[PDB]
Amino acid sequence: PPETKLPYPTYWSDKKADTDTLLYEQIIQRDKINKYSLIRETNGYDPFSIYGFSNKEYISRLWHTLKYYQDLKNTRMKSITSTSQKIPSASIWGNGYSGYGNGITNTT
Amino acid sequence: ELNENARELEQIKPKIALQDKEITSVLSNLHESNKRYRFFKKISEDPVKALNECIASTSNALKVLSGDEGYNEDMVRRANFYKENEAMLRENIEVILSNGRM
Amino acid sequence: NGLGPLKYAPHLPFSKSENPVLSTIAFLVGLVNPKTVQSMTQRAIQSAESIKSQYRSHIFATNEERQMN
Amino acid sequence: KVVDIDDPDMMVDSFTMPNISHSNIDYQTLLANSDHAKFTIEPGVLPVG
Amino acid sequence: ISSNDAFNMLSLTTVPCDRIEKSRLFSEKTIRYLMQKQHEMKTQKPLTP
């Protein structure tokens, strides 16, 4: 009995609907659905956007955020070091108080 | 007799240590099952409010574990939020303008 | 009603494949009136207790467990 | 002889019937099996989400 | 993780509420201990100058 590929899913139950055949239909349909949705659940569609919810796009976004914050911390250490050697450097927090009353921030 | 009593104490101690280990294990299991009991009781006593609370807490836990913060986006896209927080917005706008940040 | 799950847009911990019941219920809780839900679950509990009818009685049920306690 | 064909859309002769008519299990066994790394679902009998 | 596991046990198990049996309240160790101690308690000087 060669393979026949089973045309449209409800092919069987359209001829003498029984309990077992209907259960079989339900099972195979929900199996296909589960597989496809799991594949799209974690990965996503062919177009890849960092503003995706799937699993890989979420973690890609987290990695990019981490890299940005690491280089930001590098520049912050650069600012601290440069101001330690008595070379005035700008900071991500601003200058503070400028030369007036309340004196000058941006010293050691 | 002093030495004999010391010997018997040193012999009796290990079983007591083992039973203390077992007691701490059972106490931890009791804590976990009490957690579960409280969960199921909350759900059974008021199901709709419990399910809403569960959804909100799961989403907030994910947000916190990702290292995220900020306002809810759906709340701040609407115009009520800005006619209810009038005083806060006024003060902030003045502070931002007078400093040259706006 | 409300936006429901969509209200938490950037963070949505739902899985259609692995946890199929919770997503559907998240959509459904908006429609129902909660007071009738409380009434119905209380009716269910009372009817179950009445069916099994025909101190901690629910914990210690068999005769032997009470004597052991 | 049998074959485990394991592909939905190809025509078959029989299917392994899932666990539909259960038997009594105790609560502590459910507690033991409910953990991750031991919990298995069968999507053929669960609802679609 | 624990809330995920609890809700999975609650909603994703295909066991009717009747077929869930009750578990024991006394392990056999405590039963043996209680019987032994019941036996031993069933078997059970005014300052002389």
Partner: peptide
């Protein structure tokens, strides 16, 4: 003759709520 049997799908849970929170928690 041989019978062709289709056996339904039994899976273990892959993610926790659509995500794996161990890696997310590390990076966070």
């Amino acid at each position: 003759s041989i019978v062709r049997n289709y056996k339904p799908l039994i899976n273990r849970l892959k993610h926790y709520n659509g995500y794996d929170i161990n890696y997310i928690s590390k990076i966070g």
